[PDB]
């Protein structure tokens, strides 16, 4: 799924704690509201623990 | 309008537009002008009824 032409909101993404993994490779997640990107892609699959 | 599609990059809906699907043979009553433009990949629309 491609996400584009929209204003990102990662606030609810890190203000939740139900997730178990919040590792961000390449870019530091501490600065995400200051960064403007061109394209957002989001994959989704289920895998065993 | 087409056969099939594989992947896409952009979409848009905006506000609904209501129009008449009945065709006649009478004289015209409205005039519509459109301008399509591209600099640096910017797709531009200029229109006024
Ligand atoms: C869509 O798929 C084609 C493969 O035919 C690929 O070349 C193209 O880069 C893809 N588009 C996007 C936006 O990933």
Swiss-Prot record, chain B:
Glycosylation sites: 7
Domain of life assignment: Viruses
Effect of residue 32 to K: Partial loss of biliverdin affinity
Stretches the record annotates as Disordered: 15-27
Function in brief: Attaches the virion to the cell membrane by interacting with host receptor, initiating the infection. The major receptor is host ACE2. When S2/S2' has been cleaved, binding to the receptor triggers direct fusion at the cell membrane. When S2/S2' has not been cleaved, binding to the receptor results in internalization of the virus by endocytosis using host TFRC and GRM2 and leading to fusion of the virion membrane with the host endosomal membrane. Alternatively, may use NRP1/NRP2 and integrin as entry receptors.
Oligomeric form and interacting partners: Binds to host ACE2. RBD also interacts with the N-linked glycan on 'Asn-90' of ACE2. Cleavage of S generates a polybasic C-terminal sequence on S1 that binds to host Neuropilin-1 (NRP1) and Neuropilin-2 (NRP2) receptors. Interacts with host integrin alpha-5/beta-1 (ITGA5:ITGB1) and with ACE2 in complex with integrin alpha-5/beta-1 (ITGA5:ITGB1). May interact via cytoplasmic c-terminus with M protein. May interact (via N-terminus) with host bilirubin and biliverdin, thereby preventing antibody binding to the SARS-CoV-2 spike NTD via an allosteric mechanism.
Protein name: Spike protein S1
Boundaries of the shown chain within the full protein: 159 to 207 of 1273
């Amino acid at each position: 799924k491609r996400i584009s032409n929209c204003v990102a909101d990662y606030s609810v993404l890190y203000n939740s704690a139900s997730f178990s993994t919040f590792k961000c490779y390449g870019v530091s997640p501490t600065k995400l509201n200051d960064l403007c990107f061109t394209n957002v892609y989001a994959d989704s699959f289920v895998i065993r623990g | 309008v087409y056969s099939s599609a594989n992947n896409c990059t952009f979409e848009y809906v905006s506000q609904p537009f209501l129009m008449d699907l009945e065709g006649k043979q009478g004289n015209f009553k409205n005039l519509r002008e459109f301008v399509f433009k591209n600099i640096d990949g910017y797709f531009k629309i200029y229109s006024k009824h």
